[PDB]
Amino acid sequence: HIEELLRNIRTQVLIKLIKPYTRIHIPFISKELNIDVADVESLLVQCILDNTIHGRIDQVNQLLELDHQKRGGARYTALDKWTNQLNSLNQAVVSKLA
């Protein structure tokens, strides 16, 4: 069970470390966690796939971009719904009976 450990603690440290950043170098994370870059990339991929870290990885520049975005634009989504509804209703008036 020592393999399950030394991974939960690393995950918690990573989560508490990448919290305030928005675009953070991966070599910096590797230096902080005292592991090689491949392990850092694998851990980040596993965490993102598990919905524990909200961010993406820029592989070309070796960067991690966080999710300080997606503001309260849900209003637009609501409008979208209305749009399609209206479309259907239009047909229901243009082919109701004649």
Partner: protein
């Protein structure tokens, strides 16, 4: 006493206070200017700034 890296408790406390006070007069700052404002240019200015965040203090 010294908090590990040869820094007195008063020095660390006043550095944290200076960072907190400068957070009220700056929209955004650079690491070099933040270090020039309160010494410790970049080795631990970013570290202190990130430590103040994730704790509700900034």
């Amino acid at each position: 006493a010294t908090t590990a890296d040869g820094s007195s408790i008063l020095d660390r406390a006043v550095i944290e206070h200076n960072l907190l006070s400068a957070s009220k007069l700056y929209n955004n700052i650079t690491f070099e200017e933040l270090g020039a404002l309160l010494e410790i240019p970049a080795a631990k200015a970013e570290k202190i700034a990130s430590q103040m965040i994730t704790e509700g203090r900034m």
